[PDB]
Design an enzyme around this catalytic site. Structure first.
Site, mmCIF file in Angstrom:
data_model
loop_
_atom_site.group_PDB
_atom_site.id
_atom_site.type_symbol
_atom_site.label_atom_id
_atom_site.label_comp_id
_atom_site.label_asym_id
_atom_site.label_seq_id
_atom_site.Cartn_x
_atom_site.Cartn_y
_atom_site.Cartn_z
ATOM 1 N N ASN B 8 0.850 -1.192 0.000
ATOM 2 C CA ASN B 8 0.000 0.000 0.000
ATOM 3 C C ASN B 8 0.889 1.245 0.000
ATOM 4 O OD1 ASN B 8 -2.163 1.814 0.200
ATOM 5 N ND2 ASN B 8 -2.530 1.409 2.374
ATOM 6 N N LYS B 10 -0.196 4.235 -0.506
ATOM 7 C CA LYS B 10 -0.986 5.342 0.049
ATOM 8 C C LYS B 10 -0.980 6.529 -0.932
ATOM 9 C CE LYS B 10 -0.647 3.756 4.823
ATOM 10 N NZ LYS B 10 -0.395 4.149 6.238
ATOM 11 N N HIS B 91 -9.800 0.808 5.014
ATOM 12 C CA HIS B 91 -8.514 1.200 5.604
ATOM 13 C C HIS B 91 -8.758 2.344 6.603
ATOM 14 C CE1 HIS B 91 -4.256 2.560 5.781
ATOM 15 N NE2 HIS B 91 -4.005 1.296 5.497
ATOM 16 N N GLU B 161 -5.623 -4.047 11.520
ATOM 17 C CA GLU B 161 -4.861 -2.817 11.709
ATOM 18 C C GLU B 161 -4.901 -2.423 13.189
ATOM 19 O OE1 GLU B 161 -6.933 -0.194 8.708
ATOM 20 O OE2 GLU B 161 -4.939 -0.386 7.814
ATOM 21 N N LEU B 225 -0.286 -5.952 4.918
ATOM 22 C CA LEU B 225 -0.521 -4.769 4.095
ATOM 23 C C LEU B 225 0.509 -3.735 4.551
ATOM 24 C CD1 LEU B 225 -2.361 -3.643 1.824
ATOM 25 C CD2 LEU B 225 -3.618 -2.454 3.626
ATOM 26 N N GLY B 227 2.974 -0.430 4.561
ATOM 27 C CA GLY B 227 2.855 1.006 4.326
ATOM 28 C C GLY B 227 4.131 1.581 3.744
ATOM 29 N N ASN B 228 4.819 2.420 4.524
ATOM 30 C CA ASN B 228 5.998 3.153 4.031
ATOM 31 C C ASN B 228 7.189 2.271 3.634
ATOM 32 O OD1 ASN B 228 5.122 5.913 3.959
ATOM 33 N ND2 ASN B 228 5.294 6.023 6.193
#
Ligand code: NA
Ligand code: NA
Lengths: 243, 243
Positions: B8, B10, B91, B161, B225, B227-228
């Protein structure tokens, strides 16, 4: 003052329909340095739409994020728009205001993010059926919520969306014009006479091939944000009305 | 069932960075029939990212009403038309910043599965809720809002999450494991044992190269999932941990 004919495809179309529609659009000969012609497709249709359209057609996106780059899932920032070469965005469209709950505060923040990233902003606003003899009151509150941020009056384009006209009521060009002049008066009082006369103000109500002439000939109506009619090949006749 | 490492991004990236990033991704030699790897770019980066990524990588969009007057939205019909495989639903950023409810999460999955889209559906409790001992309460309510819509238990993926560890607190792999087991317990009670052993439950908290190994090897954690950490070439090492 340069005219500005915009197609808002909303959430509609396929690969085939865009291929067919853009090819019919391409066939019209017009001068892009005399007339601005912008198409706003779905985000996921942008790449496809931009390839198929000839460079005389400008292009843009139907929404932009109120935040910058970072942890904001499902959103398109103004930085990413600028990187992809996206010239225009729409901000504050009635359907986003109504369904997705965009406020005047969000429109302002979206405009700030767009202009700081060298994007041109098509800013929408307008009153409901119940509000219409409070039209001037409402539009004044909406315009003033963002208008002081306008750093260049060629790169920001106002759109009047008469929500008073899914109601059954039909707006006349005379009623459009009266509101349009009042919008320009609001810009004159806040940003100055010279800047009120630079800026384009579009009519974002029900536009088709029969009413666009009577609308575009009005003094303070400088083009259209066209909805359903822009999904037809007969959209070229609405562009022709501004030539 | 197969592991499922998803990226993801984003609201991050540029044409060149994605060009460099997807080239690092293609450089990883892995078996797609053994392990699913999905990349979730921004809507306007989808066409770009898909064409740069090899067939072994699946792709989706970060967010998903049908076709109509819904300015700024991408329907499931349009997603199907473009052969988009996955979508992310619910999300926490969309729940937070754009007020997406358990009703929206339910309606999006109904639309997604109607148009043969696969779905990565996200949920989780806050620090306040975990302080009041409501972790299983909150997850049960969020999961039971949509879990009856799951037909194929390969084609819907759950994402826990931990909003409480997104705050100051740091979730240990053992704490993530306890929650992931309860999610599978919930699924087994509502959908069946064979269905609960088919379904993937991904850790959608803070995942990087420092902790991916310890999380991945937990019994009920089926991937991430990410992120950064998925914005870097080192994402391949996070994929390697699941191989
Ligand atoms: Na005019
Ligand atoms: Na495992």
């Amino acid at each position: 003052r340069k005219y500005f004919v915009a197609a808002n495809w909303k959430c509609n179309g396929t690969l085939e329909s865009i291929k067919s529609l853009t090819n019919s659009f391409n066939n019209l000969d017009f001068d892009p340095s005399k007339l601005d012609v912008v198409v706003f497709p779905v985000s996921v249709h942008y790449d496809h739409t931009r390839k198929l359209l000839q460079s005389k057609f400008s292009t843009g996106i139907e929404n932009v994020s109120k935040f910058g780059n970072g942890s904001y899932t499902g959103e398109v920032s103004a930085e990413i728009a600028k990187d992809l070469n996206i010239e225009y965005v729409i901000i504050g469209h009635f359907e986003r205001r109504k369904y997705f709950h965009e406020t005047d505060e969000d429109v302002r923040e979206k405009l700030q993010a767009s202009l700081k990233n060298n994007l041109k902003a098509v800013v929408c606003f307008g009153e409901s059926l119940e509000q219409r003899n409070k039209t001037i009151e409402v539009i004044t509150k909406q315009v003033k919520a963002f208008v002081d941020l306008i750093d260049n009056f060629d790169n920001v384009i106002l759109v009047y969306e008469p929500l008073w006209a899914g109601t059954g009521k039909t707006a006349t060009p005379e009623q459009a014009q009266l509101v349009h002049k009042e919008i320009r008066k609001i810009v004159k009082d806040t940003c100055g006479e010279k800047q009120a006369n630079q800026i384009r103000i579009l009519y974002g109500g029900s536009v088709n091939t029969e009413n666009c002439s009577s609308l575009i000939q009005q003094e303070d109506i400088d083009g259209f944000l066209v909805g359903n009619a822009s999904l037809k090949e007969s959209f070229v006749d609405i562009i022709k009305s501004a030539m």
